[PDB]
Design a protein around this ligand. Structure first.
Ligand SMILES: *C(=O)[C@@H](NC(=O)[C@H](N)c1ccccc1)[C@@H]1N[C@@H](C(=O)O)C(C)(C)S1
Length: 261
C-alpha cells in the first residue's frame, strides 16, 4: 500500500530487493530500488520473445519457420530443445519452451534470429527501454557484478516492457495475446509472486534464478473481473536466502502488491 512496506520487506530479504508495482491506467506506482540495476537472469527471455514476435509481425520472420538443433547447442536446463537434436523446431515452440519452462538452449537458438544480445538491446532501445542491456547468451548472461551493466535491467524498465509488449501495440493483437498466453502458462512461478497474490487475478509471469543468491519474477496481473491490469516487477539480488527462501520473499512481494489492488 506504500513504498515503505517494500523497503521494510527488504530488511528480512537477505539482500537487495527491487520491486515495481505499476498500474498504467491510473498511474499508480509502488516499489523500492525501482531504477537500480539488477541481473536479469532468465527474465531476459521475456524481451527476447517480444523481439521475435515483433520481427514476425514485420514479416522478417515466421513463427512456423524451423530452426535446426545440433548437439553443440544443448546446455544445462534445456528440457525441450534436448529432445530435438538432429531435427528442427518451430520458432513458436522455441519461444514457448524458453518462456514457460526456461529452456536455456531455446533462448540461445532464438537470439541469432534477432541479431543476438546486441540486437535484443537495440530492439529494447527502439521500443523505449534505454536501461536494459542484453550482452551475453546462456549461461553467461547470469553473471552479475555491481557496476557491470551487462545483462541487467531495472524493476521500472521491466515493468515498462511488460506494458509495452502485452498492453500497448508494439505487437499485433495476435502476437500480444500469444505472448500473454505463454506468460499465463508459466511453469516456474508457482512458489513465487503467484503464491502471495489474492484470488481474482490472472497471473502471467517469467522467472529467473542463479541458483545461489538471486531470484527474479516479473508478472502481469489481469483482474478476472475484467478491467485494467497491473504490472509487477521483482528482482532479488545477492540475498543470503536460498531459492526456497527467496521464493518466500517473492511470495511476500505478491502479498503486499495484493493488498494494494
Ligand atoms: C534462468 O534464470 C535459468 N536459470 C539457470 O539456468 C540457473 N543456472 C539455474 C538455477 C537454479 C536451478 C537450475 C538452473 C532458468 N530460470 C530459473 C528459474 O526461473 O527459477 C530455472 C531454475 C527455471 S532455470
Amino acid at each position: 500500500v506504500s513504498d515503505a512496506d517494500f523497503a521494510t520487506l527488504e530488511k528480512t530479504s537477505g539482500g537487495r530487493l527491487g520491486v515495481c508495482l505499476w498500474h498504467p491506467a491510473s498511474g499508480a506506482r509502488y516499489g523500492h530500488r525501482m531504477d537500480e540495476r539488477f541481473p536479469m537472469c532468465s527474465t531476459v527471455k521475456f524481451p527476447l520473445a517480444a523481439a521475435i514476435l515483433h520481427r514476425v509481425d514485420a514479416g522478417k520472420l515466421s513463427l512456423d519457420q524451423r530452426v535446426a538443433v545440433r548437439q553443440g547447442d544443448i546446455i544445462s536446463h534445456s528440457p525441450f530443445t534436448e529432445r530435438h537434436v538432429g531435427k528442427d523446431m518451430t520458432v513458436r515452440d522455441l519461444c514457448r519452451a524458453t518462456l514457460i519452462i526456461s529452456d536455456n538452449a531455446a533462448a540461445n537458438l532464438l537470439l541469432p534470429l534477432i541479431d543476438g544480445p546486441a540486437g535484443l538491446t537495440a530492439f529494447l532501445q527502439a521500443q523505449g527501454d534505454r536501461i536494459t542491456v542484453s550482452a551475453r547468451n546462456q549461461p553467461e548472461l547470469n553473471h552479475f557484478a555491481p557496476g557491470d551493466p551487462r545483462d541487467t535491467t531495472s524493476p521500472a524498465a521491466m515493468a515498462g516492457n511488460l506494458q509495452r509488449f502485452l498492453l500497448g501495440d508494439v505487437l499485433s493483437p495476435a502476437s500480444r495475446q500469444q505472448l500473454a498466453d505463454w506468460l499465463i502458462d508459466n511453469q516456474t512461478g508457482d512458489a513465487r509472486l503467484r503464491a502471495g497474490l489474492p484470488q481474482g487475478w490472472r497471473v502471467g509471469d517469467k522467472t529467473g534464478s542463479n541458483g545461489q543468491d538471486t531470484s527474479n519474477d516479473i508478472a502481469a496481473l489481469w483482474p478476472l473481473a475484467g478491467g485494467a491490469p497491473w504490472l509487477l516487477s521483482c528482482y532479488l539480488q545477492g540475498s543470503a536466502l536460498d531459492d526456497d527462501g527467496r521464493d518466500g520473499i517473492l511470495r511476500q512481494v505478491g502479498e503486499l502488491a495484493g493488498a494494494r489492488l
